[PDB]
């Protein structure tokens with residue numbers, strides 16, 4: 001599913017992501033924009049052989065199982081395919097664990113490089129939330 005901007009903001013808020021660990025909704029929407037362009041089916045293979053899955057490009061090295069990332073963990077206790085669903089619940093629950101892991105949203109390099117420090121409220125501006 002390719003979400004609209006406000007549509008994703010609303011779904012993220014529904015699932016408790018707004019201000020989670022102090023990160024406002026616009027930070028989450030901005031991260032999803034640059035990770036997946038709001039496409040739940042996005043996948044990308046990393047140099048190390050792991051793969052990133054879903055709207056927030058969650059990595060199989062630590063967070064989900066895809067059966068083909070040697071030496072990896074599955075700390076969200078989910079198949080990586082769960083992260084590609086039109087229903088964002090699995091991605092949101094796993095992102096909550098990732099953002100709690102010590103480095104906040106810096107876990108998402110694209111968030112650090114493209115969202116951090118910017119006017120992230122632009123991403124939810126206008127939305128009925």
Ligand SMILES: [Cl-]
Pocket residue numbers: 005033
């Ligand atoms: Cl957009």
Ligand SMILES: [Cl-]
Pocket residue numbers: 024025026027120121122124
């Ligand atoms: Cl915001």
Ligand SMILES: [Cl-]
Pocket residue numbers: 065066067068069070071072
């Ligand atoms: Cl594996």
Ligand SMILES: [Cl-]
Pocket residue numbers: 068
């Ligand atoms: Cl393969």
Ligand SMILES: [Cl-]
Pocket residue numbers: 072073074075
């Ligand atoms: Cl594990």
Ligand SMILES: [Cl-]
Pocket residue numbers: 065066078079080
């Ligand atoms: Cl699995």
Ligand SMILES: [Cl-]
Pocket residue numbers: 011086087088089
């Ligand atoms: Cl949803």
Ligand SMILES: [Cl-]
Pocket residue numbers: 021022103104105
């Ligand atoms: Cl933080």
Ligand code: NA
Pocket residue numbers: 060061062063064065066069072073074
């Ligand atoms: Na894994």
